[PDB]
């Protein structure tokens, strides 16, 4: 016969493990790594207490209002596999890491000779003003940050799912128009011709 | 004695409502609001398995390996408890109901006639960069949109859990500084002195 006790300790751990993740700070890059980390881990038992509960019910007698109820469990486990590897397939598409860590919408990105850059962005807005700070240089876009490497480009893509969208440098803005000493801003409007 | 079949059907029901709660898109309004009410559904239900799990094994026998697993999940779900009445001082602060959606670190805040306005931020980034577009008006820090009422303020303050900082409107960027037209800049510089 199946035991019964495995399933109670399954919960257990379950519990342990996304009380932990609901409490990570995701301030620095390896926080960000561990709570997307502990989320793999909370799926995995999740999906490992459901089919083990599924398992006792075939051997006691699993009822009707049971069956579309777990075919409910499984179908949206399905819909969230193909999200997780259109992740991946987006970490492939912006040649960085930061879709697996960041969860944004959008992502801004353009190719240098020492950095492929990615920030993470929240929706299409026709216009992205990036700021680069002055002397640590880096490019910042509404609070997340990446480290200057080469310099800056005229296109920068805009990139999602299905999606894909291009900004060029319309003009850009000094210290000696704003009087912000140390930094410098970088207007994109959005190209449509 | 305690049934063994409420656990059973409890794990069921946090399967579907966990599976349900990690593909919502957080696009809109109404789909942030919906996911936070699921979010709050879900954590019941785990509340609920945990404490039952634990009241068979009181009645069974409860091993010291498991006193402090189960320890565990008291104390981090309490540190989560005081996290969330923060996040409703929070949202009592800046005086609008963005804190209990949009999950943020910091928010960018200003006080009109009409309308407290409230944007999220990721950190404290010495020069920010407000975005009001033409005819719609909404004012716009890094994808995250609000819509326009009243005008804009000199000082802004972003502000968290036990932080606060200002900024103070240093100069303004029209359409004939950039030659993007139908919006308009506001650049903003921290104040310390």
Redesign the interface.
Known sequence: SLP?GW??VG??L???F???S??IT??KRWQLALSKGVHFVC?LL?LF??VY?HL??VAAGLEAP?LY??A??YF??S??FV?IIMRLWLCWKCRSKNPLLYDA??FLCWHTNCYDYCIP???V???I?I?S?DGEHDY??????EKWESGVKDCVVLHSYFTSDYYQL??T?LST????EH?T?F?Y?KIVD
């Open positions: 019964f399933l109670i919960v257990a379950l519990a342990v996304q009380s932990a609901k409490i995701l301030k799926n999740l207490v459901t509960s006792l019910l049971f109820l777990y409910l469990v949206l486990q819909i969230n999200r919408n959008y962005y929240n929706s807005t026709s216009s003003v700021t700070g910042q876009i509404g609070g997340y940050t319309y003009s803005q128009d704003t009087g912000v930094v801003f207007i409007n």
